[PDB]
Nucleic acid binder design. Structure first.
Lengths: 104, 186, 61, 118
RNA sequence: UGCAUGGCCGUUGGUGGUGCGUGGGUUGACCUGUCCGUUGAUUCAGCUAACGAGCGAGAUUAUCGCCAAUUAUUUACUUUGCCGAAGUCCUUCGGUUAAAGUUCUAAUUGGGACUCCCUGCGUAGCAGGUGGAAGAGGGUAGCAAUAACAGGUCCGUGAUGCCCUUUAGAUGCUCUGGGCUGCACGCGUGCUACAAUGUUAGGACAAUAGGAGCGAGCCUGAGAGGGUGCGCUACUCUUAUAAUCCCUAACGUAGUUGGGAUUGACGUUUGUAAUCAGCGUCAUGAACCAGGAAUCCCUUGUAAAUGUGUGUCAACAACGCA
């Protein structure tokens, strides 16, 4: 998208809607660098919820960093996507935060 | 557990703690549990505040006499020196060492001190027998540094005069400065 | 000449740098009375303190 | 060594449902909270069971705030429902102050048969 | 050109913080939610125009400590039995596909500790104690929110915009040689000492790493070194009988057998090269007698001493990481 001159709002909320509707607990999108002004300035677009700490980051959080070269300057693209655990799908075990009590 | 004697020589049957005085004796740590064949031990004494009392007193000296910066560690060195004091003490006078030792630990550590005017506070019995063993052993190494004389002897010279209350001693001289400063400031 | 107190109760701590305790004491001389004195080191209740001067209480609390 | 909001809010929800199980002893209740609730780790259940025990020896006593365990809900309903024989509102003379008698004149209901003053 | 930028990292600050949905307050910036005790902690407790969801904290991951199941007679050991050597009537060594194992050794699955227990203090919790391998986050690490610093890096990059260089007598690349090691002087991190709680001489237990380079044993030479190259693709073979400490002597308070800088020569290894590299040998034998005003680090297997590996490496550690 961002090669073909879409606004960064519309480019993120394309994919951040597409991630969540497909099936995921949260996602974050960062578009770091130089649009508009001489100074670079950071966009961050987030929905859902997004776990940042511990071991449990490594199991659940998918992420991917990159960059776009342009006429003007080098932007950085960066998309973190958190998953739901399946019952033996394709993670297995739930988070160490949560517990579930049985019904009587 | 019938003989029960220090270095395999001296005994704790003597030492008359009740006889020595009132107070002071308690933090002394010579009461049965403290007695051991060798003053070396696996200490666990710095865990919670007052556990330093429950260790033996002769060990507590051997730790003080572990300085400075070269003699750190090497306790196994220090318990030779304190042995070779306690031969020189015993075989000169004929008293056994532990009696004349604990009398030295009484009369060194000054009652009172300048808490930073400056005001003259009193002391705990714990902090007396601490600053007994410092001001003995401070004087020993300060004397023994450069002196052409073995430190086992220079311990034994300090340690006899501490019992008899003489101003030969680096201990019992230095209290009468520190106690008089507390009397002056007040 | 060299009198002997004993600590009834530790009220708290004092000094600018928190260096010193102070304590209610009942005289071991047995004359009787209670003196509120600032001790230096660390004190377990029931400890005995030798005082060069029995007179003057510390200041305030 | 404080118990966090997750292990408290579990341990109250355990005693909600399963007060029919459990005891004052820890080593029993530890083994209960495996079966009652799927928990990831070992350390979690020791701290859950540790508060479940704590609340039991509070419960051997007046009723704890913010917790309801089904036996007391049944017991409150019986303790609620019944109401003692007699109104308990009849003296039946009924004492009344001097000014409050003069009120019961002004309404138009003196000679009530309920007594006056002192 | 880091004052055009990407990423990565340090820092403010690893402190306890940060801000959404609906509701209420205010013309509005904005506030409330996010407020009398407790905790390392916006940790819990409870107040209450707020109620409810988050993220960080916690949980989790890794290891160290204690357990007993599961395996192991050619990668660890032990006991007993055999055959040796000495002792020479029962003690100690070395060997063994030889029978039984698992206390040491190796590493997977689980158990274990929760303020549960008792006593004081104030429900949340706190202090002490018993037991216990371990007791108050069991110890130590790892991971670590939002919001920013024109802090750092275009000398890490096929991460990069623009500027200029390609006039090749190049700012491309490469060969020989020299620099970054040049010294009237000022500061930072370190090392070795000033000795006798020592040095000198002789005698007597580790762990973690790495290795198709490590390099076995036996010869050669005072020494460094040199030759021959057995085992190992490693719990098997190897670097590899560590050093403070300990025990017998020598010295004797002196700039002294303390101290080992600076210089002269000979004997060598690594390398295309020793001119500024390291090792050895004999000589040379300095400043320093504990350091002014100032300042740094540290609470338990910690400080301090004491060595050993590893990173860089043909050769060279006073340095970093263990």
């Amino acid at each position: 998208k961002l090669i073909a001159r879409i606004p960064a709002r519309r480019a993120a909320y394309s994919i951040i809607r597409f991630v969540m509707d497909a099936g995921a607990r949260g996602c974050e999108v960062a578009i770091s660098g130089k649009l508009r002004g001489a100074r670079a300035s950071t966009s961050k677009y987030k929905e859902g919820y997004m776990v940042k700490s511990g071991d449990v980051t490594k199991q659940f959080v998918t992420q991917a960093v990159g960059h776009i070269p342009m006429k003007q300057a080098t932007i950085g693209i960066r998309v973190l996507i958190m998953l739901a655990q399946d019952p033996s799908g394709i993670p297995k075990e739930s988070q160490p935060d949560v517990i579930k009590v049985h019904e009587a | 557990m019938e003989g029960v004697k220090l270095f395999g020589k001296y005994d704790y049957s003597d030492v008359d703690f009740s006889q020595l005085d009132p107070a002071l004796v308690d933090y002394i740590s010579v009461h049965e549990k403290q007695h051991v064949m060798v003053p070396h031990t696996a200490g666990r004494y710095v865990h919670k505040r007052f556990q330093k009392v429950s260790c033996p007193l002769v060990e507590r000296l051997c730790n003080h006499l572990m300085s400075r910066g070269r003699n750190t560690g090497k306790k196994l060195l220090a318990i030779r020196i304190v042995e070779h004091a306690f031969d020189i003490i015993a075989l000169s006078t004929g008293q056994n060492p532990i009696v004349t030792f604990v009398k030295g630990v009484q009369y060194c550590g000054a009652r009172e001190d300048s808490t930073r005017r400056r005001q003259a506070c009193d002391v705990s019995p714990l902090r007396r027998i601490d600053q007994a063993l410092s001001l003995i052993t401070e004087g020993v190494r300060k004397a023994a540094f450069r002196s052409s004389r073995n430190i086992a002897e220079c311990l034994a010279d300090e340690l006899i005069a501490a019992s008899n209350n003489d101003q030969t001693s680096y201990a019992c001289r230095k209290k009468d400065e520190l106690e008089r400063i507390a009397k002056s400031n007040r | 000449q060299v009198k002997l107190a004993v600590v009834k109760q530790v009220i708290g701590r004092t000094g600018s740098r928190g260096g010193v305790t102070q304590v209610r004491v009942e005289f071991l001389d047995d004359s009787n009375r209670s003196l509120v004195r600032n001790v230096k080191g660390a004190v377990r209740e029931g400890d005995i303190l030798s005082l060069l001067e029995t007179e003057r209480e510390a200041r305030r609390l | 060594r404080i118990r966090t909001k997750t292990t408290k809010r579990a341990a109250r929800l355990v005693i909600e449902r399963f007060y029919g199980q459990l005891s004052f002893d820890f080593q029993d209740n530890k083994r209960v909270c495996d079966a009652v609730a799927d928990i990831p780790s070992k350390r979690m259940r020791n701290k859950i069971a540790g508060y479940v025990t704590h609340l039991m020896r509070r419960l051997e006593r007046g009723p704890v705030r913010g917790i309801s365990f089904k036996l007391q809900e049944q017991e409150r309903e019986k303790r609620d429902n019944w109401m003692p024989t007699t109104s308990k509102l009849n003296v039946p003379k009924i004492l009344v102050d001097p000014e409050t008698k003069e009120m019961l004149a002004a309404i138009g209901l003196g000679e009530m048969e309920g007594v006056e003053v002192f």
